[PDB]
Design an enzyme around this catalytic site. Structure first.
Site, PDB file in Angstrom:
ATOM      1  N   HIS A  62       0.859  -1.244   0.000  1.00  0.00           N
ATOM      2  CA  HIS A  62       0.000   0.000   0.000  1.00  0.00           C
ATOM      3  C   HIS A  62       0.855   1.237   0.000  1.00  0.00           C
ATOM      4  CE1 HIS A  62      -2.593  -3.089   2.015  1.00  0.00           C
ATOM      5  NE2 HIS A  62      -3.195  -2.778   0.922  1.00  0.00           N
ATOM      6  N   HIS A  92       5.674   7.029   6.450  1.00  0.00           N
ATOM      7  CA  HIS A  92       5.416   6.606   5.103  1.00  0.00           C
ATOM      8  C   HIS A  92       4.862   7.813   4.343  1.00  0.00           C
ATOM      9  CE1 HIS A  92       1.577   6.224   7.201  1.00  0.00           C
ATOM     10  NE2 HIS A  92       1.066   6.687   6.038  1.00  0.00           N
ATOM     11  N   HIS A  94       2.134   9.104   0.893  1.00  0.00           N
ATOM     12  CA  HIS A  94       1.109   8.855  -0.117  1.00  0.00           C
ATOM     13  C   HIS A  94       1.444   9.772  -1.260  1.00  0.00           C
ATOM     14  CE1 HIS A  94      -1.469   6.854   2.945  1.00  0.00           C
ATOM     15  NE2 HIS A  94      -0.850   7.696   3.721  1.00  0.00           N
ATOM     16  N   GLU A 104      -3.268  13.471   0.690  1.00  0.00           N
ATOM     17  CA  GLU A 104      -4.537  13.019   1.275  1.00  0.00           C
ATOM     18  C   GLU A 104      -5.276  14.256   1.796  1.00  0.00           C
ATOM     19  OE1 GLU A 104      -3.561   9.447   3.725  1.00  0.00           O
ATOM     20  OE2 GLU A 104      -4.493   8.619   1.918  1.00  0.00           O
ATOM     21  N   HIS A 117       3.553  11.037   6.355  1.00  0.00           N
ATOM     22  CA  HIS A 117       2.901  10.782   7.628  1.00  0.00           C
ATOM     23  C   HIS A 117       3.890  10.170   8.591  1.00  0.00           C
ATOM     24  CE1 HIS A 117      -1.228  10.532   5.563  1.00  0.00           C
ATOM     25  NE2 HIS A 117      -0.830  11.814   5.787  1.00  0.00           N
ATOM     26  N   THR A 196      -6.179   6.715   7.500  1.00  0.00           N
ATOM     27  CA  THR A 196      -6.666   7.007   6.131  1.00  0.00           C
ATOM     28  C   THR A 196      -6.713   5.748   5.268  1.00  0.00           C
ATOM     29  OG1 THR A 196      -4.525   7.521   5.213  1.00  0.00           O
ATOM     30  CG2 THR A 196      -5.743   9.379   6.247  1.00  0.00           C
ATOM     31  N   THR A 197      -6.324   4.613   5.816  1.00  0.00           N
ATOM     32  CA  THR A 197      -6.518   3.360   5.144  1.00  0.00           C
ATOM     33  C   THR A 197      -7.267   2.425   6.077  1.00  0.00           C
ATOM     34  OG1 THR A 197      -4.600   1.943   5.856  1.00  0.00           O
ATOM     35  CG2 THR A 197      -4.171   3.579   4.213  1.00  0.00           C
TER      36      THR A 197
HETATM   37  N1  LIG Z   1      -2.124   6.865   6.670  1.00  0.00           N
HETATM   38  S1  LIG Z   1      -2.182   6.858   8.272  1.00  0.00           S
HETATM   39  O1  LIG Z   1      -3.511   7.284   8.748  1.00  0.00           O
HETATM   40  O2  LIG Z   1      -1.019   7.500   8.783  1.00  0.00           O
HETATM   41  C1  LIG Z   1      -2.031   5.188   8.802  1.00  0.00           C
HETATM   42  C2  LIG Z   1      -1.049   4.777   9.748  1.00  0.00           C
HETATM   43  C3  LIG Z   1      -0.983   3.424  10.123  1.00  0.00           C
HETATM   44  C4  LIG Z   1      -1.876   2.480   9.625  1.00  0.00           C
HETATM   45  C5  LIG Z   1      -2.848   2.841   8.741  1.00  0.00           C
HETATM   46  C6  LIG Z   1      -2.913   4.149   8.348  1.00  0.00           C
HETATM   47  F1  LIG Z   1      -3.886   4.556   7.502  1.00  0.00           F
HETATM   48 ZN   LIG Z   2      -0.647   7.671   5.782  1.00  0.00          ZN
END
Ligand SMILES: NS(=O)(=O)c1ccccc1F
Ligand SMILES: [Zn+2]
Length: 258
Positions: A62, A92, A94, A104, A117, A196-197
């Site tokens: 992902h 990570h 996006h 995002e 993030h 967000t996932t």
């Molecule tokens: N993209 S996020 O909200 O930082 C995120 C962090 C960890 C797991 C799932 C996620 F979606």
């Molecule tokens: Zn994220």
């Protein structure tokens, strides 16, 4: 089969397996900069990453995660809207297929080329898996990327991506300093939201920095050479791994600055 970012398994489908997709505090959102309220009582963020220990980088199918040793208070976020201490577990990004999309969050509907993030969990819950079950379990520091000059502190990440091209590949990744990914200013917006996932859990205090970082076209191009698939499966470039903005519902976005 499983959730993703395609036509057939992307964000408009997620709610069938993860009904909280249509919940009251989903992320990301559009940040309407004129409607955000300055909150003079919001404290400066405290970002304390001097003792951070990166360990590994992983393509999870992902995105890619740079993972940290979170078994001690080595890299922590505190202050701002937060009560207590939040430990860095991973960062990570996006990003988009084109420089015109990929973030995002959006700012007055503007999309950035990518979004970083930095994910942290509240130490009062003992581990990440318990934290994500709590409404104040996580703090995610979000940082926009625009394309222009290179970010020299990103290059070590870009250069290892050839070694983790496909889903499930990992590589050792020690001694990486995430302070080289931050902008100059720590001015921010904050609101209560979600992962967000999937599983889209409503456990995140979002802290989104106002100042983007610049990265070069060549750096983001390398992100777009990653694959969503596993080795020996049909090649699908890892691009457009972002969820679009979700309804704000009964939330107010606060600003640390005027
Ligand atoms: N993209 S996020 O909200 O930082 C995120 C962090 C960890 C797991 C799932 C996620 F979606
Ligand atoms: Zn994220």
């Amino acid at each position: 089969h499983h959730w993703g970012y395609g036509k057939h398994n992307g964000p408009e489908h997620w709610h069938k397996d993860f009904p909280i997709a249509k919940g009251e505090r989903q992320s990301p959102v559009d940040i309407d900069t004129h409607t955000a309220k300055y909150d003079p009582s919001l404290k400066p963020l405290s970002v304390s990453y001097d003792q951070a220990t990166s360990l590994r980088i992983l393509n999870n199918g992902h995105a890619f995660n740079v993972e940290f040793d979170d078994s001690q208070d080595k890299a922590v976020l505190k202050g701002g809207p937060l009560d207590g201490t939040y430990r860095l577990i991973q960062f990570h990004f996006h990003w988009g297929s084109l420089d015109g999309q990929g973030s995002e969050h959006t700012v007055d509907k503007k999309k950035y080329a990518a979004e970083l993030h930095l994910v942290h969990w509240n130490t009062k819950y003992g581990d990440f898996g318990k934290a994500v079950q709590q409404p104040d379990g996580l703090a995610v520091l979000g940082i926009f990327l625009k394309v222009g000059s290179a970010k020299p502190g990103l290059q070590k990440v870009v250069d290892v991506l050839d070694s983790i091209k496909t889903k499930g590949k990992s590589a050792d990744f020690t001694n990486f300093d995430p302070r080289g990914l931050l902008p100059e200013s720590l001015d921010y917006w904050t609101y209560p939201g979600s992962l967000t996932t999937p599983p889209l859990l409503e456990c995140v205090t979002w802290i989104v920095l106002k100042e983007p970082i610049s990265v070069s076209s060549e750096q983001v191009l390398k992100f777009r050479k990653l694959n969503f698939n596993g080795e020996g499966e049909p090649e699908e470039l890892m691009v457009d791994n972002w969820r679009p903005a979700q309804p704000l519902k009964n939330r107010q976005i606060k600003a640390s600055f005027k």
